[PDB]
Design a protein around this ligand. Structure first.
Ligand SMILES: *O[C@H](C)[C@H](NC(C)=O)C(=O)N[C@H](C(=O)N[C@@H](CCCC)CN[C@@H](CCCC)C(=O)N[C@@H](CCC(N)=O)C(=O)N[C@@H](CCCNC(N)=[NH2+])C(N)=O)[C@@H](C)CC
Ligand SMILES: [Cl-]
Ligand SMILES: [Cl-]
Ligand SMILES: [Cl-]
Ligand code: NA
Lengths: 99, 99
């Protein structure tokens, strides 16, 4: 699709068998999802932005479907106020900024 | 241009006659820049990010160039970790997200 930016660019994702809403965030290096179970091993990470830092769990090789487009990559899980799809998965669905 | 997301989407901006670097950020409602002097009166605003909330100074109808495109609009100034160009100005330069 072509997504205009008059409103927040929210899409449906499927992760871990669950449907969620998430924000497409070109300003995020990483993908960060609210608390949920994911398979495999994890390691802790601290990630920051406006307001400071939160602690998350890093899971690798997670398959996600983003507005219908499958991608695989690292997903961070923790107390984020908003589910965010960051660049590590936006690249995989071929997302670009155009002007 | 067409900007891919393998690296951070950093562009040069011009504000107050000065060149700065900023992040094109579809996940930001607003444009937030690090401490600098801007003309006129400001109004208070609270904004949120991944770590919580911060207070910023809201300046309206500020002239700002983004990657060579002229915009005039609201700029927030405060303790953001990075300069961010949000949707308020991304819409003025005609930016879309495409996949
Ligand atoms: O981790 C890397 C190194 C990097 N961190 C830093 C410190 O650079 C990073 O990628 N951080 C990510 C991040 O927070 N990126 C932000 C830009 C760069 C840091 C400032 C942009 N993220 C968005 C979405 C965050 C959602 C939790 C963001 O902060 N949006 C704000 C911007 C402020 C503004 N007023 O526009 C935002 O839109 N805030 C509005 C509220 C939105 C509330 N939405 C809901 N649903 N409640 C607002 N009006 O205040 C993070 C994500 C780590 C990878
Ligand atoms: Cl990844
Ligand atoms: Cl590409
Ligand atoms: Cl504006
Ligand atoms: Na894994």
């Amino acid at each position: 699709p072509q997504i205009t930016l008059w409103k927040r660019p929210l899409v449906t994702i499927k992760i871990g068998g669950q449907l969620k809403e998430a924000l497409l965030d070109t300003g995020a290096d990483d993908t960060v999802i609210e608390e949920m179970s994911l398979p495999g091993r994890w390691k802790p990470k601290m990630i920051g932005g406006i307001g400071g830092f939160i602690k998350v769990r890093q899971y690798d090789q997670i398959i996600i479907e983003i507005a219908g487009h499958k991608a695989i990559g690292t997903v961070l899980v923790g107390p984020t106020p908003v589910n965010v799809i960051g660049r590590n998965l936006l690249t995989q669905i071929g997302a670009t900024l155009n002007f």
